[PDB]
């Protein structure tokens, strides 16, 4: 059936001409059995021979039938290429385009989960939290079954690296709960500023970390504990001695006490001022500003560009 689909692929390279109004259905059906290419090849090992074959099909659809073709083939690329190294992070850069128009429906949302993990590998957390949230929020209606729960699982990972996360125990489903059970106490350890609470989570749940695949950020989150830990105590305490805060900051010597807060201002954490003698950290705050300009001026282009798209939709849907 894959060879018959290859005869469908050669005919996908020829006729046309002209408006092969049946090739969109060929994009649909073939994307299915291109995922059956994935499953059948995954019965033994990776499909890498079909990675050059997919690149042959993905590039030969350029630029003509890429519409709805390139989106599904790019997910076929991204999925298993996310499983097998490498370079896809910089490959999708030059691949885009975008590629418009987004089709079909949830296809672009799941693509923003796939490339969401990609753009999360660059660790920029504003684009990563917006691509992970837009991946899950844009996907109706399910069932089935658990991979729509998986995008929600890995979604708040970048929110754990942000330094502030809510407790998600109220969002647990009858399935997603039993799947993330270790990840529960993980994000609970991210909320708390305790080091041993987070390290014990790593040692105990490291097996589930192998099941999810996300590891490297678990050891560096200790720096999120020192920055959220100092954000906690500084804003918390009136004037805290560097010896008393040294328990939760685990070192906080008389020297590095300057950099903890100073290099936190470099990251935009706390404004606390410290005169170092013994010393003591005296945290004050005076700010009255902002909450104004970018939100309202962007809302102008937001609403207008939106209603313009809703025009491009409604105005063009009146053919009947």
């Amino acid at each position: 059936s894959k060879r018959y689909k290859e005869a469908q692929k050669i005919s996908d390279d020829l006729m046309q001409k002209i408006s092969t109004q049946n090739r969109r259905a060929l994009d649909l059906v073939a994307a299915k059995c291109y995922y059956y290419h994935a499953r059948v090849y995954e019965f033994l090992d990776k499909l890498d021979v079909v990675r050059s074959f997919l690149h042959a099909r993905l590039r030969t659809a350029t630029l003509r039938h890429d519409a709805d073709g390139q989106a599904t083939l790019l997910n076929l690329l991204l999925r298993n290429y996310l499983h097998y190294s490498l370079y896809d992070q910089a490959e999708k850069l030059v691949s885009k385009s975008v590629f418009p128009e987004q089709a079909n429906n949830n296809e672009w949302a799941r693509y923003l989960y796939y490339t969401g993990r990609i753009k999360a590998i660059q660790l920029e957390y504003s684009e990563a939290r917006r691509t992970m949230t837009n991946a899950l929020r844009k996907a109706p209606q399910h069932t089935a079954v658990g991979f729509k729960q998986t995008v929600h699982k890995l979604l708040i990972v970048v929110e754990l690296l942000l330094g502030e996360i809510p407790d998600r125990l109220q969002f647990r489903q009858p399935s997603l709960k039993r799947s993330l059970m270790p990840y529960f106490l993980l994000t609970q350890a991210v909320r708390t500023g305790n080091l041993a609470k987070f390290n014990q989570v790593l040692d105990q749940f490291g097996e589930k970390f192998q099941a999810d695949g996300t590891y490297t950020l678990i050891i560096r989150l200790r720096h999120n504990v020192i920055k959220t830990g100092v954000r906690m105590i500084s804003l918390s305490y009136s004037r805290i001695s560097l010896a008393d805060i040294a328990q939760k900051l685990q070192l906080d010597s008389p020297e590095d006490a300057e950099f903890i807060v100073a290099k936190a201002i470099r990251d935009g954490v706390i404004e606390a001022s410290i005169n170092h003698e013994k010393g003591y950290v005296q945290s004050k705050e005076m700010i009255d500003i902002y909450s104004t300009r970018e939100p309202q001026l962007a809302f102008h282009q937001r609403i207008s560009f939106c209603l313009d798209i809703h025009n491009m939709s409604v105005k063009a849907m009146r053919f009947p």
Binding site: N106, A144, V145
Partner: peptide, 24 residues
Amino acid sequence: MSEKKQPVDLRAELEKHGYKMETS
């Protein structure tokens, strides 16, 4: 859908706050 992606796979506190008095 079922198409595409998904088919693939300080306490409260009671005791401690009352103890803070008689501690010191």
